[PDB]
């Protein structure tokens, strides 16, 4: 009748080892005293248990004796049992008072407080078997995976924590913690679950707590209480909702990333249950490594069909790590400034960073020179009434077929956070606008958006983008949408001149197919035209041969600035908000008259674009005010503005070559 | 059990390769090994090999990666075997998925299923038949696939950039009727513009007829109805993961001379030519290096790349 066979693993002394793991600690007073007391202090609920430290402890308990039984393998081997075992130990070592706990304060804590008060009183009076340990918690234990940088100890095969394919998943991983990855599907909305739910009786009272086990339970009436029982006759009892302990519950299915799908078959989703604090952490469409115990929840019946028992399972969520979590938000600027300073001290930050954007390609130091500004942006303005004036830079890159214009855009959208790369046919009109059930512009805003094949985008798209240079706007009046959403987006647009390539016998604006209503919005239009040159193309060929041949391009001598620290610098740049001095202002004005007059004295056709509409002025003030910020400024000196004019005139005027 | 029905190099095979690598003429034999049933087109076959190998892959430190693989297009009057060639591409290809015209939906996309090929074909050879017929809507995506080397899905939704690095072949009918042969260097292709560039090699084949060539067709066709080919893919895999030839200063000046020549003279002759062409030069050089099994790139290889890109152009 149900045979038994011993196993080398024993939970008795392992619990002891857990107790020695908790509250007795050194390496990080100890972390398990403070981390526990902050929960006891009731500002904190989630208890994040790292398996990394469990790994650290065994070293001290082995080599370095005295030797003990292993957990890290024994945990993930089971990992369900430890939630009811490893976590109950916390009850034995927890600080009792702990500090300033009171009663109300908290809702529902007063209920149980009065429960134990009336229970203590009435029991101590009667004597003149206790409320379950799971009802009194108000905290959740969550294990986390060991990737790990310190997993190299090495325990080798100990890691799962193996960011595995949904296909890789087997029936041999049930009851064993497994990380998985994929896109969130259907992300069902949160509903309360249940744990105890102690119903209330009537006549003689007391309480009884029915365990919520598996998926469901059967409700009971009768009477459990001996007093109401048999005399006279059976006391009636109802469930009290205030007394019950509720744990948030949210379920969501996750399909595979589809790159992990073979040449054949089909994407296979996996159902994932969420509890406690981790709730709402998950959002639809987001690739995430979700780790958790892998479990069945049978069967609810049916029960005829399978037969058997055919578990069908699900994944309990434990920890959540999402891919792709950001300036401008950081407080400090503590010793991180140090990480900025290696970049500052060398001086000539502007050229250095400039070159450091997309070094992967050769030439066009001007283009990059400006793209640095694009990434930086600022400063906008508020007129106090108020209305806004952007606020950011809008770049175009013209010319064809080669010159590798789009690689700069993969570059930027790689470097800048909140960057998004799209193409015309490509990203549909419904791609940029937001449906009711956004993308592109809304999806990427407060950061740079990137466009390719900017000609082929047809019409409805061009109206969106034509409008978004009023910034702060899209307006969708269609059907179920009256909203006006806010897009703070920056735009960079790579486009090809009218076929085939830039016919010089045609005037500008002829070989640029784009209307003048739109171009007035663009502050900087870089037209990249290609005329074969024997000297330079040698240098180029040397570059593109050198890499491939090597991966690292610059040598003898330059130091390419890593994108991470670079993003840090730019982050520290965006914080400044500089202001113009009187002298640079006047200079801007005078130079603007000279630029207007010289542009128009040129005459109609070819040359151009006119008219140098005020958006070019405001544009050059805004570029000025950008260049200032890499000086970190607040001064906004004359050489800044002059430099802005330089970038502007150099943009075009390359059509004379 | 489940035995399916319709790689392992053992001791001996790898030795056969090793012996065979030294011989100087092997490339031509190999290039002939593809076509038991198909005349001539030695240049095109050469191409398909050079796609099977494909210029290693190079991912720079903290920077974008340059495209390794080579993409090919074939344009000519029907009966050119263009649709016949591709199946034989498919068989020995080691992957990948075939796609014919429309085709789609999403082609390579995940479609973000509520509530594709190019991804599933990663590290492989995608075929495209009737490449012209395909809706522009898709082409817009193919731009992103080919050079950029990645696919991006913002759809609803799961928002991710997932990688499809596939190599690509396409066969596409001439614009209208048989007119391809005489018709201008442009207006003949029918699918402007950047696409024309994205493809590393644009090969044109003519069905124009001659009596001599005809006879020479006749006999082989006849005999058809009445060194091993399988050794070809085994020859290929070891070549692929072993070993990447890197790059050498033997060659560079050659491809630079060549490239500059192309731009300067051909921009008078024909079109299109850009930095893209240069990239392609390097990929071809490295691929032919793989064919040679050489741990290094060489000048001879450079000359070969030169040759095929010439027959592409002329
Ligand atoms: Zn009662």
């Amino acid at each position: 009748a149900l045979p038994s066979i011993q196993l080398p693993v024993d939970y008795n002394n392992l619990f002891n080892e857990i107790t020695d793991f908790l509250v007795t600690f050194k390496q990080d007073g100890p972390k398990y005293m403070a981390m526990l007391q902050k929960v006891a202090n009731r500002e904190l609920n989630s208890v994040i248990i790292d398996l990394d430290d469990i790994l650290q402890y065994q070293n001290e308990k082995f080599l370095q004796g005295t030797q003990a039984d292993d957990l890290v393998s024994a945990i993930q081997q089971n990992a369900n049992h430890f939630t009811e075992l490893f976590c109950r130990a916390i009850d034995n070592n927890m600080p009792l008072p702990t500090k300033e706990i009171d009663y109300k304060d908290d809702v529902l804590d007063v209920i149980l407080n009065q429960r134990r008060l009336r229970n203590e009183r009435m029991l101590s009076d009667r004597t003149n078997e206790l409320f379950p340990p799971n009802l009194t918690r108000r905290y959740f234990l969550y294990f986390k995976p060991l990737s790990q940088n310190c997993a190299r100890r090495y325990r080798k095969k100990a890691i799962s924590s193996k960011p595995l394919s949904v296909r890789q998943i087997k029936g041999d991983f049930l009851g064993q913690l497994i990380t998985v990855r994929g896109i969130i599907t259907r992300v069902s909305d949160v509903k309360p679950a249940v744990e105890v739910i102690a119903y209330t009786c009537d006549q003689c009272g007391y309480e009884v707590f029915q365990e919520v086990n598996s998926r469901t339970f059967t409700p009971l009436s009768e009477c459990t209480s001996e007093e109401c029982s048999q005399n006279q006759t059976k006391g009636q009892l109802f469930m009290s909702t205030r007394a019950s302990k509720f744990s948030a519950f949210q379920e969501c299915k996750i399909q595979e990333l589809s790159q992990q799908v073979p040449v054949g078959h089909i994407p296979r989703s996996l159902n994932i249950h969420v509890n406690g604090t981790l709730v709402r952490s998950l959002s639809p469409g987001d690739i995430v490594d979700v780790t958790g115990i892998f479990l069945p929840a049978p069967y609810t019946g049916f029960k005829a069909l399978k037969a058997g028992l055919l578990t069908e399972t699900y994944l309990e969520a434990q920890f959540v790590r999402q891919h792709k979590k950001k300036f401008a938000s950081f407080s400090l600027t503590s010793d991180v400034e140090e990480r900025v300073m290696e970049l500052i001290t060398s001086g000539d930050v502007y050229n250095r960073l400039a070159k450091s954007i997309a070094p992967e390609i050769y030439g066009n130091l001007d283009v990059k020179k400006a793209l640095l500004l694009l990434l930086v942006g600022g400063v906008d303005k508020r007129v106090g009434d108020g209305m806004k004036i952007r606020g950011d830079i809008n770049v175009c890159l013209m010319g064809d077929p080669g010159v590798a214009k789009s690689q700069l855009l993969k570059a930027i959208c790689k470097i800048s956070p909140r960057g998004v790369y799209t193409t015309g046919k490509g990203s549909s009109g419904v791609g940029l606008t937001a449906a009711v059930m956004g993308g592109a512009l809304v999806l990427a805003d407060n950061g740079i958006c990137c466009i390719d094949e900017f000609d082929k985008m047809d019409e409805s798209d061009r109206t969106a983008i034509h409008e978004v240079m009023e910034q702060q706007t899209i307006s969708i009046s269609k059907a179920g949408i009256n909203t006006t959403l806010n897009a703070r987006t920056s735009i960079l647009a790579a486009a090809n001149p009218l076929y085939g390539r830039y016919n010089p016998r045609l005037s500008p604006l002829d070989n640029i197919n784009l209307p003048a209503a739109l171009l007035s919005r663009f502050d900087i239009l870089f037209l990249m035209l290609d005329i074969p040159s024997r000297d330079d193309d040698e240098k180029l060929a040397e570059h593109v041969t050198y890499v491939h041949m090597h991966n690292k391009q610059p040598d003898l001598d330059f130091t390419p600035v890593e994108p991470s620290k670079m993003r840090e610098y730019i982050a520290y740049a965006k914080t400044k908000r500089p202001v113009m001095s009187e002298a640079v202002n006047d200079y801007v004005v005078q130079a603007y008259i000279r630029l207007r007059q010289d542009s128009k004295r040129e005459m109609d056709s070819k040359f151009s674009f006119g008219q140098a509409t005020p958006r070019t002025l405001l544009g050059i003030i805004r570029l000025s005010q950008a260049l200032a910020k890499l000086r970190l400024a607040d001064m906004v000196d004359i050489d800044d503005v002059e430099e802005a004019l330089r970038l502007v005139r150099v943009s075009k005027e390359s059509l004379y070559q | 059990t489940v035995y399916p029905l319709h790689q392992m190099l053992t001791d001996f095979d790898i030795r056969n390769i090793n012996k065979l690598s030294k011989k100087k003429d092997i490339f031509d034999i190999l290039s002939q090994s593809l076509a038991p049933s198909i005349y001539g087109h030695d240049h095109i076959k050469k191409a398909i090999l050079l796609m099977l190998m494909g210029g290693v892959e190079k991912n720079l430190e903290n920077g974008s990666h340059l495209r390794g693989d080579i993409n090919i297009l074939m344009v000519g009057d029907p009966s050119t075997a263009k649709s016949q060639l591709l199946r034989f591409v498919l068989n020995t290809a080691s992957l990948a998925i075939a796609t014919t015209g429309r085709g789609s939906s999403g082609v390579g996309l995940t479609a973000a299923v509520t509530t594709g090929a190019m991804v599933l074909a990663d590290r492989g050879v995608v075929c495209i038949d009737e490449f012209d017929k395909m809706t522009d809507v898709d082409r817009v995506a193919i731009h992103e696939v080919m050079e950029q080397q990645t696919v991006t899905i913002a759809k609803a939704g799961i928002h991710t950039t997932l990688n499809a690095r596939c190599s690509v072949i396409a066969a596409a009918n001439p614009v209208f009727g048989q007119y391809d042969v005489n018709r201008d260097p442009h207006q003949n292709i029918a699918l402007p513009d950047s696409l024309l560039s994205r493809f590393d090699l644009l090969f044109v084949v003519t069905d124009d007829i001659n009596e001599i060539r005809d006879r020479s067709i006749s006999e082989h066709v006849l005999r058809t109805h009445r060194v091993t080919i399988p050794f070809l893919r085994k020859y290929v895999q070891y070549a692929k993961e072993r070993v990447i030839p890197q790059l050498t200063q033997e060659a560079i000046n050659v491809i630079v001379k060549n490239y500059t020549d192309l731009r300067n003279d051909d921009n008078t002759k024909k079109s299109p030519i850009t930095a893209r062409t240069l990239e392609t030069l390097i990929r071809l050089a490295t691929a032919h290096a793989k064919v040679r099994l050489s741990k290094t790139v060489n000048k001879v290889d450079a000359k070969v790349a030169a040759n095929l890109l010439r027959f592409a152009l002329l």
Side-chain angles (χ1 to χ4, degrees):
Chain A
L2 204 142
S4 177
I5 290 179
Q6 66 184 8
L7 298 199
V9 182
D10 184 13
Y11 298 130
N12 190 28
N13 68 332
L14 177 63
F15 177 77
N16 202 335
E17 184 182 354
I18 298 169
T19 61
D20 292 349
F21 178 75
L22 295 174
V23 165
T24 63
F25 180 60
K26 192 46 186 180
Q27 304 296 325
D28 298 326
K31 182 178 180 62
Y32 293 130
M33 286 188 173
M35 192 174 69
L36 196 157
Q37 190 183 345
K38 281 189 293 290
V39 171
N41 299 332
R42 304 174 293 96
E43 283 76 30
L44 188 54
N45 300 282
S46 67
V47 186
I48 305 288
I49 292 288
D50 61 331
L51 297 161
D52 312 311
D53 191 22
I54 307 181
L55 195 268
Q56 304 294 153
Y57 178 68
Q58 305 178 319
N59 298 144
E60 186 59 30
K61 281 327 287 186
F62 185 62
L63 303 152
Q64 273 75 4
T66 60
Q67 62 176 20
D69 267 20
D70 178 275
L71 280 177
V72 188
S73 280
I75 291 173
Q76 57 165 18
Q77 186 56 252
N78 194 320
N80 194 23
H81 193 195
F82 290 93
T83 58
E84 300 179 344
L85 188 147
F86 181 90
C87 190
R88 65 180 284 287
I90 291 194
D91 180 39
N92 298 334
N93 54 42
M94 179 172 287
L96 62 80
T98 59
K99 45 188 299 183
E100 63 181 330
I101 61 171
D102 305 332
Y103 53 110
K104 175 84 159 44
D105 184 1
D106 202 14
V107 59
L108 173 155
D109 182 27
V110 287
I111 307 180
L112 174 61
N113 203 343
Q114 291 176 336
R115 296 294 173 81
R116 296 193 172 264
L117 187 149
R118 67 179 297 271
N119 189 18
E120 184 176 3
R121 190 176 186 259
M122 295 295 95
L123 192 142
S124 300
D125 298 325
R126 188 179 62 188
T127 189
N128 192 31
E129 303 285 329
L130 197 140
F131 301 164
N134 192 28
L135 188 147
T136 77
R137 298 291 293 280
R138 204 187 164 279
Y139 65 84
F140 285 109
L141 200 142
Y142 299 142
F143 307 82
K144 82 170 71 171
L146 62 80
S147 307
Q148 189 62 50
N149 300 333
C150 75
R152 283 197 174 73
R153 177 72 55 191
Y154 61 96
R155 206 172 164 79
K156 48 195 194 68
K157 311 173 58 69
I159 61 171
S160 308
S161 181
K162 196 185 52 180
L164 49 81
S165 188
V166 201
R167 299 297 180 87
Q168 176 67 57
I169 306 182
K170 203 173 177 297
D172 293 333
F173 296 172
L174 278 166
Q176 295 181 336
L177 195 151
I178 70 182
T179 306
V180 317
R181 67 167 58 189
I183 286 88
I184 302 297
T185 301
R186 154 93 48 87
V187 60
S188 84
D189 291 339
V190 51
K191 295 194 59 63
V194 60
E195 184 74 18
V196 296
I197 303 301
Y199 59 80
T200 62
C201 184
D202 184 28
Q203 306 178 332
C204 289
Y206 299 85
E207 284 304 302
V208 184
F209 296 98
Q210 188 173 347
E211 288 298 327
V212 191
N213 278 338
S214 55
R215 180 51 170 191
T216 63
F217 60 97
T218 192
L220 54 90
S221 65
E222 55 260 358
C223 202
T224 305
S225 65
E226 53 186 348
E227 294 303 324
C228 287
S229 191
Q230 303 128 340
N231 203 33
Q232 188 177 351
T233 303
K234 299 173 185 296
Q236 187 60 256
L237 62 80
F238 310 129
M239 60 197 70
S240 52
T241 60
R242 45 194 176 186
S244 68
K245 179 58 181 186
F246 288 112
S247 47
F249 181 103
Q250 173 161 28
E251 52 175 337
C252 68
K253 290 152 62 181
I254 281 89
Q255 288 166 343
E256 330 185 312
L257 177 63
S258 73
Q259 73 178 8
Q260 306 180 308
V261 172
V263 295
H265 307 143
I266 281 183
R268 176 197 311 273
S269 51
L270 188 147
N271 191 351
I272 282 180
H273 295 150
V274 177
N275 298 71
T277 312
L278 312 155
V279 72
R280 294 171 183 88
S281 186
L282 300 188
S283 318
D286 301 328
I287 312 175
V288 50
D289 287 354
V290 166
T291 74
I293 294 169
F294 193 74
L295 290 191
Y299 183 40
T300 59
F302 315 138
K303 300 173 296 286
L305 283 65
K306 274 84 170 172
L309 177 296
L310 177 63
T311 60
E312 174 270 353
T313 189
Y314 66 77
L315 171 71
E316 189 58 31
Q318 283 295 281
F319 174 88
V320 178
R321 181 182 308 183
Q322 291 186 341
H323 295 97
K324 188 191 63 60
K325 63 174 296 183
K326 184 178 173 62
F327 55 82
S329 63
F330 65 91
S331 177
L332 57 82
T333 307
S334 176
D335 80 26
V336 180
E337 288 181 346
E338 176 276 336
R339 295 174 181 82
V340 177
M341 292 173 185
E342 301 91 1
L343 191 145
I344 294 173
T345 58
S346 295
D348 184 69
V349 173
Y350 181 70
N351 190 340
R352 181 174 178 171
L353 290 177
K355 183 69 178 297
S356 295
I357 291 105
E360 289 84 359
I361 67 166
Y362 170 73
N364 301 131
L365 183 145
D366 181 6
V367 180
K368 302 169 183 178
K369 201 78 167 294
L371 296 180
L372 177 61
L373 296 174
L374 174 58
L375 295 174
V376 180
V379 180
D380 75 21
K381 190 61 174 171
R382 182 177 177 81
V383 300
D385 296 342
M387 64 193 82
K388 277 73 177 182
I389 56 174
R390 66 178 186 85
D392 188 350
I393 308 300
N394 291 337
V395 179
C396 182
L397 301 176
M398 191 67 73
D400 54 351
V403 182
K405 58 181 63 182
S406 175
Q407 295 298 102
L408 286 79
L409 304 188
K410 181 193 288 179
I412 287 177
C413 295
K414 183 187 294 178
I415 294 169
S416 174
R418 183 65 69 180
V420 165
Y421 173 72
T422 59
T423 178
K425 292 294 181 64
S427 176
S428 295
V430 63
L432 53 83
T433 191
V436 169
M437 65 191 82
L441 299 175
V442 175
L443 180 63
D445 54 351
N446 196 27
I448 294 96
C449 179
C450 301
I451 295 171
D452 292 348
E453 298 172 351
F454 183 79
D455 282 344
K456 278 70 179 180
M457 63 185 289
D458 290 344
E459 187 277 335
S460 177
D461 298 342
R462 283 188 173 87
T463 62
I465 293 172
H466 184 196
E467 192 281 334
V468 180
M469 304 302 185
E470 187 272 338
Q471 202 68 61
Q472 296 299 323
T473 304
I474 298 174
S475 296
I476 302 101
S477 296
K478 290 179 294 296
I481 305 101
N482 295 287
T483 64
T484 61
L485 47 79
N486 286 338
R488 287 190 286 275
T489 71
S490 306
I491 292 171
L492 204 158
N496 293 341
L498 181 61
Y499 64 88
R501 60 182 67 85
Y502 184 76
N503 192 338
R505 292 183 176 87
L506 276 61
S507 177
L509 186 145
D510 180 358
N511 55 32
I512 290 175
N513 297 130
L514 298 180
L518 196 149
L519 268 63
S520 63
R521 296 181 177 278
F522 284 162
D523 52 357
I524 293 172
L525 188 148
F526 286 149
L527 60 87
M528 298 172 182
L529 62 80
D530 185 5
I531 294 99
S533 296
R534 187 180 299 277
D535 186 6
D536 296 344
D537 296 345
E538 293 300 327
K539 295 177 68 66
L540 186 148
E542 291 181 352
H543 193 280
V544 182
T545 51
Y546 176 79
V547 174
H548 303 285
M549 179 177 74
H550 294 283
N551 294 342
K552 57 173 291 181
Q553 295 168 328
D555 185 6
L556 182 63
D557 61 350
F558 177 78
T559 179
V561 174
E562 66 284 7
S564 59
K565 182 178 291 295
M566 175 175 69
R567 286 173 298 184
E568 179 66 16
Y569 179 80
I570 295 170
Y572 179 77
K574 290 175 68 67
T575 63
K576 292 293 184 291
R577 184 172 295 103
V579 177
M580 292 178 286
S581 77
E582 188 283 334
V584 300
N585 185 334
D586 186 4
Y587 178 79
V588 172
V589 175
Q590 293 175 335
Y592 168 70
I593 291 103
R594 295 179 184 83
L595 175 60
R596 175 70 69 185
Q597 187 177 357
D598 70 17
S599 178
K600 288 174 176 176
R601 66 177 295 277
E602 164 54 25
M603 294 300 293
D604 174 65
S605 295
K606 183 68 180 295
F607 297 164
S608 67
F609 300 93
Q611 292 179 336
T613 58
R615 286 180 177 173
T616 56
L617 173 60
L618 194 147
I620 199 164
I621 295 171
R622 189 168 61 202
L623 290 171
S624 172
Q625 197 171 359
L627 292 169
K629 292 167 66 180
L630 298 177
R631 182 172 298 108
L632 300 172
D634 293 345
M635 295 296 104
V636 184
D637 291 347
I638 185 65
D639 186 5
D640 180 351
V641 176
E642 175 64 18
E643 181 63 15
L645 278 74
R646 183 176 69 84
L647 274 66
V648 175
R649 69 175 67 87
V650 177
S651 67
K652 287 182 64 66
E653 307 307 317
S654 175
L655 62 82
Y656 294 145
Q657 302 303 321
Chain B
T1 59
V2 191
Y3 319 85
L5 58 92
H6 298 82
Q7 188 169 353
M8 57 196 84
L9 294 172
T10 63
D11 290 344
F12 174 76
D13 298 341
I14 185 170
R15 186 183 69 80
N16 294 282
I17 292 104
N18 289 287
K19 184 184 72 65
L20 192 145
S21 63
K22 275 72 179 183
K23 297 167 61 180
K24 270 66 180 180
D25 188 66
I26 59 173
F27 173 74
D28 188 6
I29 291 172
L30 295 172
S31 297
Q32 291 180 335
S33 61
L34 300 179
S37 66
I38 297 172
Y39 301 111
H41 300 296
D42 285 344
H43 296 164
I44 288 173
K45 301 295 183 292
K46 294 177 187 298
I48 291 172
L49 259 64
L50 289 175
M51 181 185 72
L52 291 175
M53 304 303 178
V56 186
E57 177 67 11
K58 184 176 171 61
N59 195 343
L60 301 175
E61 184 276 335
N62 74 0
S64 178
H65 67 286
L66 281 75
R67 182 189 70 198
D69 63 353
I70 296 96
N71 297 333
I72 295 97
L73 184 145
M74 298 174 71
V75 56
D77 291 344
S79 67
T80 303
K82 60 181 69 178
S83 296
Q84 182 61 63
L85 176 61
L86 295 178
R87 297 305 182 90
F88 170 71
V89 172
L90 186 147
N91 292 336
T92 63
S94 175
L95 285 69
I97 295 98
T99 64
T100 61
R102 59 175 72 89
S104 297
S105 298
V107 188
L109 254 68
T110 62
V113 173
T114 61
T115 62
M118 188 70 74
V119 179
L120 295 174
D122 182 354
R123 295 288 184 184
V125 176
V126 174
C127 299
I128 295 170
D129 299 348
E130 294 296 320
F131 176 81
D132 58 354
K133 300 292 183 291
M134 295 180 73
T135 64
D136 58 354
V137 175
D138 186 12
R139 299 183 183 278
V140 179
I142 295 173
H143 290 166
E144 181 64 13
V145 169
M146 294 181 65
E147 187 178 11
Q148 190 66 58
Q149 207 74 48
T150 66
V151 177
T152 52
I153 299 167
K155 185 182 290 181
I158 295 98
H159 301 163
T160 189
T161 299
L162 51 83
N163 287 280
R165 51 174 296 171
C166 305
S167 59
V168 176
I169 296 177
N173 292 131
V175 183
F176 296 96
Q178 60 183 20
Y179 292 143
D180 186 8
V181 176
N182 193 342
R183 182 179 288 177
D184 293 347
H186 296 293
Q187 299 168 336
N188 194 343
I189 299 99
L191 49 85
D193 187 4
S194 178
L195 286 172
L196 276 66
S197 62
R198 296 283 182 270
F199 293 147
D200 290 345
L201 301 175
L202 295 171
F203 293 163
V204 178
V205 183
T206 64
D207 185 70
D208 284 344
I209 59 100
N210 300 133
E211 59 182 340
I212 301 97
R213 299 286 288 175
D214 176 8
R215 178 59 63 87
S216 62
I217 305 304
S218 66
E219 291 97 3
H220 179 194
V221 173
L222 294 174
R223 74 178 65 193
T224 301
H225 296 286
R226 302 181 71 251
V227 203
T228 68
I229 297 196
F231 174 86
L232 192 155
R233 60 178 62 84
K234 292 179 297 301
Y235 178 83
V236 177
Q237 65 180 20
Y238 178 80
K240 290 172 64 181
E241 66 267 1
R242 291 185 181 176
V243 177
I244 60 104
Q246 295 91 5
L247 191 144
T248 60
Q249 191 169 354
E250 290 295 320
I252 294 169
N253 294 127
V254 175
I255 64 173
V256 172
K257 178 180 68 66
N258 190 344
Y259 173 77
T260 58
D261 182 6
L262 290 175
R263 291 186 66 84
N264 295 336
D265 295 346
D266 189 10
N267 289 335
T268 58
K269 301 298 183 182
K270 292 181 297 298
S271 296
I273 300 295
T274 56
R276 193 178 306 281
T277 62
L278 188 145
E279 295 180 351
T280 64
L281 291 174
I282 288 174
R283 300 180 189 84
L284 270 66
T286 300
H288 189 279
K290 289 178 181 175
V291 177
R292 181 181 291 177
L293 278 72
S294 175
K295 180 61 173 172
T296 57
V297 172
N298 191 337
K299 180 180 76 179
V300 178
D301 294 340
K303 302 293 179 64
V304 176
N307 190 339
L308 287 179
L309 196 146
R310 290 295 185 277
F311 177 80
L313 273 65
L314 283 74

